[PDB]
Design a protein around this motif. Structure first.
Motif, short mmCIF file in Angstrom:
data_model
loop_
_atom_site.label_atom_id
_atom_site.label_comp_id
_atom_site.label_asym_id
_atom_site.label_seq_id
_atom_site.Cartn_x
_atom_site.Cartn_y
_atom_site.Cartn_z
N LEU A 20 -1.70 3.40 -5.31
CA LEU A 20 -1.15 3.49 -4.04
C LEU A 20 -0.96 2.18 -3.51
O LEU A 20 0.23 1.80 -2.72
CB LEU A 20 -2.14 4.25 -3.06
CG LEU A 20 -2.10 5.80 -3.79
CD1 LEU A 20 -3.30 6.36 -2.86
CD2 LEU A 20 -0.78 6.31 -3.44
N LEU A 67 2.20 0.41 -4.86
CA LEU A 67 3.56 1.09 -4.43
C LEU A 67 3.90 0.46 -3.00
O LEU A 67 4.84 0.10 -2.80
CB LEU A 67 3.04 2.51 -4.37
CG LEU A 67 3.16 3.45 -5.66
CD1 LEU A 67 2.85 4.82 -5.36
CD2 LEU A 67 4.60 3.41 -6.25
N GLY A 68 2.79 0.42 -2.24
CA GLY A 68 2.89 -0.11 -0.78
C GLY A 68 3.48 -1.54 -1.04
O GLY A 68 4.30 -1.88 -0.23
N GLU A 82 4.61 5.61 2.43
CA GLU A 82 3.55 6.46 2.27
C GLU A 82 3.77 7.75 2.50
O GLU A 82 3.45 8.71 2.03
CB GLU A 82 2.14 6.19 3.03
#
Ligand code: LMZ
Ligand code: LMZ
Ligand code: LMZ
Ligand code: LMZ
Ligand code: LMZ
Ligand code: LMZ
Ligand code: LMZ
Ligand code: LMZ
Ligand code: LMZ
Ligand code: LMZ
Ligand code: CL
Ligand code: CL
Ligand code: CL
Ligand code: CL
Ligand code: CL
Ligand code: CL
Ligand code: CL
Ligand code: CL
Ligand code: CL
Ligand code: CL
Ligand code: CL
Ligand code: CL
Ligand code: CL
Ligand code: CL
Ligand code: CL
Ligand code: CL
Ligand code: CL
Ligand code: CL
Ligand code: CL
Ligand code: CL
Ligand code: CL
Ligand code: CL
Ligand code: CL
Ligand code: CL
Ligand code: CL
Ligand code: CL
Ligand code: CL
Ligand code: CL
Ligand code: CL
Ligand code: CL
Ligand code: CL
Ligand code: CL
Ligand code: CL
Ligand code: CL
Ligand code: CL
Ligand code: CL
Lengths: 152, 153, 154, 153, 153, 153, 153, 154, 152, 153
Positions: free
Chosen positions: F38, F41-42, F48
């Motif tokens: 995560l 990805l950010g 999100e």
């Protein structure tokens, strides 16, 4: 750099050779012995100067070869036979111990022991290699017998 | 043609003295091996009064027992019986390897032939299938090699 | 019908002197083995005043320790305890092989039986499942083989 | 309950004489092992004037060097360092097996404990991760077994 | 901690080297020998102090090396040759036994024996390593001969 | 020289929709992978609100969950997380093989790239060392292959 | 980054479960089934919504599970049984094919199939894992049935 | 004497359109493979304007990329490049197996030949020794099989 | 918890069974087929309702079994034969692919296929298992044929 | 006694149309296989005017070629020839596995029998020893299965 290189000597005249044949998978050791004795004669080994004994299987090679070497009547010995894999780890145990004893005897007595014990997966592999390995062991016994003399 | 001296195998057990060490792990197996072994020895002519049988917990204890019996030089040949049956761990390799290696070492260092009748198999069924045969085999190995050791002394 | 002399196993520990070398790698395992071992020896009749226990870092040090204890001839039988647990490398094979080989060699060259209680397993759980059993086993091997060595000694 | 004599381990290095043979194949590994080893020895109280360090090309040469140092009996315990890293061939098994077996044989036949600090790993990264730890471990092993060998004499 | 560190010595002047070349897969051992002799000369070894003998295969190395070492005419020995995997377990047997004998001789006689026997799966692997392994064994023989001298009382 | 069109990789996550299926066997590992995933990805620009995360008991359940998420075509690319750690049985091979094969089959049959972040290791320590890295890797794989799949449509 | 995380749902109320039990090494599958059914009840699954059938061995699981899944009477399926290594490669073949079919059915039909087939070397390993694996498969069937619903348009 | 029709291999690349997917794990390897591949295609007569090259993170992503390129039917043949080098875990087996299986499946299901130039080796040195050769090999496979697919197409 | 447990049904009356026998190591498949047909009769299968075909080796089982199943004339099929390890990875390839095709056929057509293909290291292992596996496959064909009916 | 209908094998090749794809890696091997194969086909009565022979670079290319020839439905049966000979890497397993798997898949999905005559051996000598035999075998497999496929259509 040109050092002294001892040239191999394959003259069998006068040599005394012992042969221990494991009989498990008998047809194999017999083919090895027929090729082996035949080659020894080709190298000049007297038929009257070869003793041949046999044992049940490859694990009995150690004790027999050990005596013949410790007698010091022989310039070199030959071990023959065939370990053919079946269904169990017995193949690894026999292959390992028979070869290990052949090594140990040669080191501790100074008598070269040609290792002609096949360690193969199938009957066909042993048949394909029998005669070749037999004659090879004859040439190994002769050559190493002569090499041992030069180093005594 | 090459015609050398071929020492003929000698399977005459008359007068031979045999020692037997039976590892008891997987006891049914070694018991069957010993039943076949003793019977074949009798067939070969070995006197029951000339056979000693001892037992040890497992194959790793065969070495120390066989070593004494050989070093006493009361025995013309020895026999090791037992079964290593693979379970879940590398212990199978360790035991198979070390027991066989000690059987080899004893014969070489003392001159007393030791028939190796320790099975190394994956399953109980394999051990059962080979027990009786391996016992009888060891009978013929002990007798034959006892005579061969004498003939070369 | 062939009826030879069958030497009966002898599990009487009275009077025996036992040495124990415990490898401490994976210490929880060897400690559990030793607890089971000492308990079983007592059950077999071994006096606690006749048992010596030493410890080494790992299984590869068992050889040298056992070697000294046997060569002193103060002991009727020895016991090796410990656990080789596979990790990520061929080190597992090396340690398993060499420790067992040394245990075999000591017994052959000195005549002193050495019970091999060194586990060689893939996982902690296998070692835990086997610890106590192997400990008591080694107690019965030490007693039995100590007596067998006596029966075969001149 | 059963309470026997338990010899408690002794990690006091004061007065001990230690020999170290460092195999140089994959030199970065053995060098890192030796830095950790000497440091730990110092922490345990071993005098630097009582430590000898020699080096050999590879792990297969450890046997002969360690054999002399032990047979001199100037050392209470020895340490073998180095790294066998698998490449493309069965040479990995051969080296791993023989170096470890020789370390075992020397300790058995001379009584001088030999800490085995020869890594046997598949990759350079595994060796790097284990270098320092194995060096300090071998330092603690040499001291402890040196004292244990004394207690049994 | 700054202990006594015996520095490696690669001076071949005055050293006596024996070389046993197994001839199975002869092209390999020949390339090893050419590289080996060339490197020895580079290190200062006199050609009059080098003996080279040959045996059929790697299993004959043991007995030959054993005699040469027990004569104590040599400061160090070198074993050359190649075991190349074919179709059977013979590969493992030969690799294992030849290496074990090379180890045993050095331990029991004190004469370092450089292990230059390749153990590979294919001819191409042996060809790629031949010359490198020959020269390496030269540096191992010289270095270990000098190390053995430094440790001889 | 030959200079063809080389599609340069595109790691811009803006606007992408990502699905993640986390196997929970050895939960500490997959949880650590997801935290790294995560985060990456950010960093790549993925919203999100455009990421869905579901979890299943073990690696063998990844196939059916990933199959639905891909067949919905709400996602440009998917990510599979988890750890298969060898224990005592051939179950390790079975799980490793089938989970990876299903991840492959889903990507081939639906066109939705599926980053395979299921570790297959022998020990807990190996899994811990690889968790975070593999999580971020799978984040970069999902983005890149999502964009590549778009460029080919 | 805080994305949408679908929370696991272990509520079995209303779920319909099919169970195929291979009977080879029958004691194992029976213990698995007792543990499995007991856990399903604990999760709230009605006994009137569970069907249990049995097949001779693990290779028959494929066809049986295939029909039950293609009927779409079941929200999730469970495969139980045990492949225990004997003497031959049959162990690998059965372990491999049964697991591959369980994987294939779930992918092609969308019905989750919990893989509860043990693949072990010994009876003792199967006995030690039987009950645990049965209950686990109950939790996998319930959880994946609910997950499949949450992802069905 | 039996003399059937033997279709002769055709290595003329004129007019062929080739796609290449290069896995970047162990990037030095795939880059070297691609340099050898492009060079050989040019030698075979392939126009550089008819070659497309894309790259993926690793060998497990080859399947999806190759799948799209084949299903477009813009390409006469595809080429997969990369290197799976064994490390410390069964991941080597998984990646090697799955990447080759997907390369096989794509060619079977779409009719587009896919040269498999993904190395599966134990060491960096093995991959370096094989990189250029495998690259040129894959060029000759793509050209030859592109033409064979034409000779067998209705 | 007491759910519905479908009780196995070993009644062969009325069933139609196909058998494909790989002939490599022929003595093995013949022993399997003799035991197999014999057991089918014991279960109540009509001799007039069994077709037996043979193929050269285990890798040919897939295509033959595939046709017989796709005809949907058969309630269940049986594959017989023996893969005996020799000297090469051919053993693994044949063992793997023959079993994989037997699995694939049953899944894609719904026709159960009893896998009676031995994968063993030695001739003796195949001989020891032949008759047992043959009769087992008869019971598998019957039982699974009946199970397929309950699920249609 | 049970006397069912046994379809007798039919080895009459008259009128059959056979396609052959020869992988050329280790070309001497496939050439020998094809020489034995064509000769046996003639012995079985196959017209040379009804046989097509094509060749591909290696075994991994057999799939795509065989797939076309089968999907044309001009051929009653196909034959794949070639040799995978182990070298130094896991590539041997990959090629052996994938080529055999594609030969299997093609026969199943198209109904055209494909004789698998691709050797998977460790050494050149093994490939030479099996080439001619495997070629003739594939001739009898193609003919026999071509007739069997017709008899079941
Ligand atoms: O079992 N296979 C073999 C074998 N077994 C017997 C063994 O050597 C020994 O005779 C017994 O263990 C009794 O001591 N002996 C061989 O020479 N080859 C084999 O292939
Ligand atoms: O564990 N399996 C076996 C085994 N283990 C015990 C071992 O030999 C020894 O007794 C102990 O380690 C104690 O020293 N001993 C066998 O003869 N067969 C086996 O199959
Ligand atoms: O590494 N694993 C283990 C281990 N390693 C250390 C080794 O025995 C020795 O202490 C060192 O090599 C130092 O000489 N020792 C064990 O008893 N069990 C293991 O599982
Ligand atoms: O090859 N790999 C290694 C190695 N080979 C050399 C060997 O020890 C010996 O020095 C030569 O055979 C010369 O006698 N030595 C190591 O210590 N580690 C390795 O990883
Ligand atoms: O067979 N392969 C090899 C081999 N066989 C012969 C063996 O060393 C021995 O000389 C004979 O058994 C006679 O005693 N010797 C090698 O050095 N390398 C090989 O690769
Ligand atoms: O067992 N080890 C593991 C495992 N087993 C469970 C399996 O994935 C599955 O959930 C069950 O068979 C139920 O269907 N699952 C993992 O993800 N990692 C492991 O290491
Ligand atoms: O043999 N061992 C096993 C086994 N054999 C039978 C096989 O699954 C199948 O039923 C038959 O081949 C008939 O098709 N089935 C298992 O579930 N576990 C085993 O451990
Ligand atoms: O790990 N070793 C390798 C590897 N791992 C990554 C893998 O292909 C994939 O990118 C990830 O699983 C993400 O989906 N990829 C390779 O091409 N070669 C390797 O040697
Ligand atoms: O080779 N060993 C075996 C075998 N080989 C032939 C193979 O199935 C096939 O017929 C050919 O590849 C031609 O297509 N077939 C078997 O059933 N058992 C074996 O043990
Ligand atoms: O490498 N060994 C072999 C091999 N490699 C090439 C492979 O089949 C394929 O052509 C390439 O990967 C390009 O796609 N092909 C064979 O038929 N036999 C071998 O022994
Ligand atoms: Cl010569
Ligand atoms: Cl056997
Ligand atoms: Cl040959
Ligand atoms: Cl006789
Ligand atoms: Cl066990
Ligand atoms: Cl002794
Ligand atoms: Cl001796
Ligand atoms: Cl038998
Ligand atoms: Cl008792
Ligand atoms: Cl480790
Ligand atoms: Cl237990
Ligand atoms: Cl401490
Ligand atoms: Cl290497
Ligand atoms: Cl010794
Ligand atoms: Cl000693
Ligand atoms: Cl670690
Ligand atoms: Cl230097
Ligand atoms: Cl010594
Ligand atoms: Cl990038
Ligand atoms: Cl497990
Ligand atoms: Cl598919
Ligand atoms: Cl597709
Ligand atoms: Cl890492
Ligand atoms: Cl939960
Ligand atoms: Cl799908
Ligand atoms: Cl060409
Ligand atoms: Cl890895
Ligand atoms: Cl190359
Ligand atoms: Cl029943
Ligand atoms: Cl074969
Ligand atoms: Cl059976
Ligand atoms: Cl016929
Ligand atoms: Cl290769
Ligand atoms: Cl197709
Ligand atoms: Cl089909
Ligand atoms: Cl043949």
């Amino acid at each position: 750099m040109n050092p002294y290189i001892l040239t191999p000597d394959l003259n069998g005249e006068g040599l005394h050779i012992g042969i221990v044949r494991a009989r498990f998978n008998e047809e194999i050791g017999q083919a090895q012995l027929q090729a082996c004795l035949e080659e020894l004669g080709k190298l000049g080994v007297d038929e009257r100067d070869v003793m041949v004994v046999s044992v049940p299987g490859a694990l009995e090679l150690g004790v027999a070869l050990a005596r013949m070497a410790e007698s010091y009547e022989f310039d070199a010995l030959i071990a023959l036979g065939a370990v053919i894999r079946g269904e169990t780890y017995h193949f690894e145990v026999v292959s390992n111990e028979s070869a290990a004893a052949i090594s140990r005897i040669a080191l501790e007595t100074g008598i070269p022991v040609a290792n002609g014990v096949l360690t193969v997966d199938t009957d066909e592999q042993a048949q394909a290699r029998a005669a070749g390995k037999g004659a090879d062991c004859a040439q190994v016994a002769v050559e190493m017998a002569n090499l041992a003399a030069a180093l005594e």
